[PDB]
Design a protein around this ligand. Structure first.
Ligand SMILES: *[C@@H](C[C@@H](O)c1ccccc1O)C(=O)O
Ligand SMILES: *[C@@H](C[C@@H](O)c1ccccc1O)C(=O)O
Ligand SMILES: *[C@@H](C[C@@H](O)c1ccccc1O)C(=O)O
Ligand SMILES: *[C@@H](C[C@@H](O)c1ccccc1O)C(=O)O
Ligand SMILES: O=Cc1ccccc1O
Ligand SMILES: O=Cc1ccccc1O
Ligand SMILES: O=Cc1ccccc1O
Ligand SMILES: O=Cc1ccccc1O
Lengths: 326, 326, 326, 327
């Protein structure tokens, strides 16, 4: 009954935490738009998404209050009613707090936690390994998705880390970034379903068609048809050997993303991860992500425009692929 | 009335948060040794310290539970009974949590908060400036000490930031690191008492003897007589023009610190800031800092040994200077 | 007539610059073992290598004198006698010096230059683009291989740079590092043959089997049979669709490389790239790389041991795959 | 002339550019050094009372000059100075043998020393860097050495233990030093070296250690040297009287003049455009003609150039003000 790596296939969409209009103000106390939360979930299920992730960086795990988090997760779990797997996010400044939060949110009904590492003090390899072992020991029923983001969490999630995570049965998946070492990490970590970012799924699926069956998406929050079409066409390509349509969709996605990162730079992107993702979603018009909670509520205008252009581009793909789905 | 920069003078000692023997275990609750806490406070006051700071990096602001912090601050306040100023620490992942914590700990009776910036997402200049404005607006009774540590908080606390902080009345001081730009920062920020690290106090006090009248010390947790002697001798040097004795103390301090940083690297020290400072204090034998709360409870044995040697060296200074004091 | 991208296929092996016994001494003036140079070239040709690169970082382009370089290239050119393509390396501190060297080495009979960028001052995108345009304009008959090493050259060779290089006809190939963005770079640069590192060839050829027909090898300097076997088996996998044997070879290569990098870290490897590669080659016993020219003649002993072990592992692969080719 | 000592290095040490002809950005050009402007600059600096001349670091285009250009430039400087003030050439190169070759030649022409960074294609570690400088000093025992301690250019960060090692090499008499955060300690570790802070840090550094910190390096002097001369003179008087206010005010003026030089206030971004920004500043100040940048470093974003030009104008304004205070 605890999720397994084998159960993780297809399109895994990361949803934001919708905010109320006053959410940028430090005086506000209940800034989660719970009805927009429910609406997003039902829409994602209806689109055919395989699983839902949440409460990473752009999902504002860092900036929600604890009451906000419990209300958000409660609404998601009530809406899903067990139809698709759901991961909350419980990254925090220390092990004991992560355990506390993970227990409560799993109890409310999440299947797992998408989890980075404590980042006030930069972790080394043995520290990070111990940290995930501790969480899995404390909350054995929780599945774990490693949130392998070095910009946010400082630690760089190196090859030997993956070898160690593959020994922890609760660690079933990873929100993975660049795929330069995917070939080796798959070999080191046979028990983990590695999720590339949607734009890299095409390449990664070609490297290892047996293992690479799933990906994570934030572009889906601008309209999920694109990600659904990618998933479907890659399944087809694996069967027929004809990768041309999968390549065409993947190239479209890359172009849609081409203006997102300020000056092409993930490090500059990472300073504005929240505002840029939420602005992109706002601009696409598929969902209302809303204002960013403090302190990350200021984004330079030219960067915002890049994100908004990207949101329009993904909306255009959603309309194109909605028709191709029929 | 709220502490002013003018009132910040002399030796400001940063105390750890003493641990019980089980504190490394994620299963433990109530890991603060509150009696050792009280005993340290009384010893610091008896030594003649001007002010007490706490709950920075090595003070485990990151890894204490909220109940632990409340108990710790309560014990400190009851012990001090208003005789020296006291800063708690309330750095957290977002502005609302910082505000919440700061209000409570000030209400218990701390005079101010030693505060870095939220660090899951790296802050830019306008974000950092607005964050400190927000806290000051929200808790106008709290004095603020800027905890200007780029390794921990990613933000690098640049020149223009200091100019902005000088416009916020609550910002009375800074826990400052390298003094390469202290001359300019002093000009940009006339209203802030900049605290160099104890080892840099000699140089900084010669640069600007009118403004640089105070320093921060962790070495005092290995025996405060060194820091007290430095303070007293600098006051004398500023009056006589004879800096020989102040220089010799300051040079002893740098030597005592020479084995602390792994391979002389601040970045490598920063990965083990908690464990190395605590291990040094344990080794010096002036107080019992105790085990590190999870996750930061693993330190390479070579690095520990440098820390221990530094601890013994500072204990030797304390012995030497205790005799010169009386 | 100048090489084209279409003409670049199979195993492209990077040769060191063999040194005399006294080569680590600044007093020495003629440190290239020209007979070992000739021997290595004929052995690489006999093994069936497709082309030869030289005079990158471990090839000691930085530390050879000009007379040494000319003598080295003269010996290579006269040994090859037009049988396989050959690239010299002409990276230098400024455009004029690069041009002067490129003209003379091409005149002697190299087909092209493996070229990084001037690195005293870190280059930006338009500066780097102009640099390569200037070299191609000055020496129109030289093929260029982009040496895309950010550690050495500071510049990071971003996506827009590849789009620009594809417009320069002389730019036919790239010595490329991590393949995270290879899918996109191939799309942005249709006219370049991108050479992944031998360990990444498997994944890269699976990503794009039409475009990725070639790779670069330094492991071949420990015995080229492994690289020739990889090449041949990838050709067969592309035709049959059965990748298992190519995968086995590739996995073997990565295991042989697993001790090369100090602490698994490319940046720490990059500080000792010369001494580590040359020590690895010396240990494998296929060729005599010899001492490193000053200043890069000092390598920590444990790092050396890692490289020697890698050399032994690669030698063992060469003996294994020698038999499978016979 | 016996080799320079640290004790002989005092006052304002000005770093000169390598003046360029109008066609100097074109890779096709040879002889891009304006040798008459070179001579003129030297005589103007001597007339202003500078204590020593440095050259051929980063903005001095050590990386982008040809060898023939360097020889002509150094020959012109040496015949112009005619022994009146000490002079350092620059011989940083990609390897030890090339450094040695260039250093022997330029010393032989008549420079007193070399301002020397480390080979930077491969990032050096501590023992590698120490042996490099030992090798140069062994090879060219009559050259004084100025350590050019620039981590951005040279990758190596010139750590504390390195300075303890350099202090054992008699040839190493000075350092072009950057931020002063560890100056107090470096002085203690390296008793035999005259550390030169940047002109803007001289005030602070001289107050930290007035016995040891008697000299600084200046690129601002290339915009009009009166400011550097006045700073020098006023710090000498401050050390004697204990009244630092006038020295403080000049220093504060200098920092203000520098406030727009670094793109976004960032040393690392300035470092990408070190040549073009320094040379543009000097061109804007109008005291000398630095001229175009040799390839490849001939492209600078417009916004950044503008900050450099504003800085040049501000330093020209300081020169005019302090020229009047000098009488
Ligand atoms: C995960 C998503 C970010 O880490 C990220 C990474 C790469 C491209 C775009 C985005 O948003 C998260 O924010 O939880
Ligand atoms: C402050 C002290 C550290 O940030 C620090 C910095 C430099 C040397 C030693 C120490 O501990 C804190 O941990 O609160
Ligand atoms: C090219 C090869 C190096 O840049 C390098 C990169 C990665 C792994 C191993 C090696 O040698 C050269 O040194 O010319
Ligand atoms: C030395 C001067 C540069 O490295 C530098 C550093 C800081 C401010 C300004 C300048 O020019 C040189 O370029 O030779
Ligand atoms: O570098 C950032 C990044 C983000 C998502 C996927 C691949 C990447 O390289
Ligand atoms: O570089 C680290 C550092 C830490 C505390 C004080 C001064 C310093 O330079
Ligand atoms: O990024 C460094 C690197 C080095 C060798 C091979 C592949 C790589 O990604
Ligand atoms: O960090 C850059 C820098 C440049 C010149 C002088 C002092 C400095 O800190």
């Amino acid at each position: 009954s605890r999720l397994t790596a084998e159960d993780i296939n297809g399109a895994w969409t990361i949803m934001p935490t919708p905010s109320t209009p006053d959410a940028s103000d430090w005086r506000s106390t209940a800034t989660v738009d719970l009805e927009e939360t429910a609406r997003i979930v039902e829409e994602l299920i209806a689109a055919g998404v395989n699983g839902i992730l949440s409460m990473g960086t752009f999902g504002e795990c860092a900036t929600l209050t604890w009451d906000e988090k419990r209300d958000y997760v409660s609404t998601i779990v009530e809406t899903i009613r067990g139809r698709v797997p759901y991961f909350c996010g419980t990254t925090a400044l220390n092990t004991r707090e992560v355990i506390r939060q993970t227990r409560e949110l799993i109890d409310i009904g999440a299947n797992g936690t998408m989890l980075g590492v404590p980042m006030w003090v930069k972790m080394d390899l043995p520290t990070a390994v111990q940290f995930y072992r501790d969480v899995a020991d404390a909350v054995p029923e929780a599945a774990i998705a490693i949130y392998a983001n070095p910009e946010a969490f400082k630690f760089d999630f190196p090859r030997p880390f993956w070898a160690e995570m593959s020994k922890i049965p609760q660690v079933v998946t990873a929100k993975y970034l660049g795929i330069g070492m995917l070939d080796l990490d798959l070999r080191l970590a046979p028990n983990i379903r590695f999720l590339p970012h949607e734009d890299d799924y095409y390449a990664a699926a070609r490297i290892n068609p047996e293992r690479i069956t799933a990906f994570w998406s934030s572009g889906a929050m601008c309209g999920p048809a694109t990600a659904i079409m990618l998933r479907d066409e890659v399944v087809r390509a694996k069967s027929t050997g004809d990768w041309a349509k999968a390549k065409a969709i993947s190239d479209d996605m890359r172009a849609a993303d081409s203006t997102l990162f300020p000056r092409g730079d993930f490090s500059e992107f990472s300073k504005y991860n929240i505002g840029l993702e939420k602005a992109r979603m706002d601009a696409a018009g598929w969902l209302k992500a809303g204002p960013c909670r403090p302190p990350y509520n200021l984004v330079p205008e030219d960067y915002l425009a890049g994100a908004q252009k990207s949101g329009k581009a993904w909306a255009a793909l959603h309309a194109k692929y909605s028709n191709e789905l029929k």
